[PDB]
């Protein structure tokens, strides 16, 4: 339960290109810090470097919507890699089941554009239904927006813990 050493093990696996194992230990460190993601993970543990490493681990495993979810963990939301990852079609993750963990309206706008351009209308309807949510309104009061982001963050990281532990 030493998150510093868990991050060290995750990075050791990350350098050797064991991306599944690296993700395992990053999520283990996060679950040490926040009590199984019940609280916010401290920024001095899930730093932008750690989150970027997690992004690379998810991308190299073809879990592209998971890359899109992790892209809004960063202090400055990285839309370039998020949009690049969502363009991929060889996904090995649940895809449309993860659209409930996206709280950024820009990511969902791009998802709706992508599913409309590529012709999948039902997934496009799922993304539109996700945008058309009261708690998702970008013009909401701030404390509502962090609460939506925090609950989606908790659910997403717990789902990843279930998948990767």
């Amino acid at each position: 339960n030493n998150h510093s050493w868990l991050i060290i093990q995750a990075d050791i696996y990350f350098a050797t290109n064991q991306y599944s194992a690296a993700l395992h230990y990053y999520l283990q460190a996060g679950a040490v810090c926040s009590d199984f993601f019940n609280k916010a993970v401290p920024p001095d543990v899930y730093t932008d470097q750690v989150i970027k490493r997690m992004i690379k681990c998810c991308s190299l495993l073809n879990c592209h919507t998971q890359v899109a979810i992790l892209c809004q963990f960063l202090r400055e939301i990285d839309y370039k890699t998020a949009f690049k990852s969502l363009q991929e079609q060889n996904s090995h993750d649940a895809m449309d089941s993860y659209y409930d963990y996206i709280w950024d309206v820009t990511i969902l706008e791009y998802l709706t554009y992508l599913h409309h351009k590529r012709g999948e209308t039902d997934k496009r309807q799922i993304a539109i239904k996700a945008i058309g949510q009261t708690e998702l309104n970008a013009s909401n009061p701030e404390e509502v927006l962090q609460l939506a982001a925090q609950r989606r963050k908790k659910k997403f990281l717990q789902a990843m813990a279930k998948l990767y532990f």
């Binding site: 079609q89 060889n90 590529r118 012709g119 209308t121």
Partner: protein, 71 residues
């Protein structure tokens, strides 16, 4: 501006060319002229209907704008 061009209805199946069609509404089904448009569950009753219709003996789907036009 009139937009005489139209969009396609394909998926471009990959090899992980050929495409599967998408659903298109108001494509004017030709059920009385084409037996391939007949659903299996609605086959016998449609068969009876168009059998009667061919003999000596869809409609009512007007757009709502031109539906209450009494002038």
């Amino acid at each position: 501006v009139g937009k005489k061009v139209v969009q396609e209805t394909g998926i471009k199946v990959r090899s992980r060319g050929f495409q599967v069609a998408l659903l298109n509404k108001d494509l004017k089904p030709q059920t009385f002229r084409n037996a391939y448009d007949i659903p299996r569950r609605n086959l016998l009753d449609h068969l009876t209907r168009m059998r009667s219709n061919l003999l000596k003996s869809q409609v009512h789907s007007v757009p709502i704008a031109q539906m209450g036009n009494y002038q």
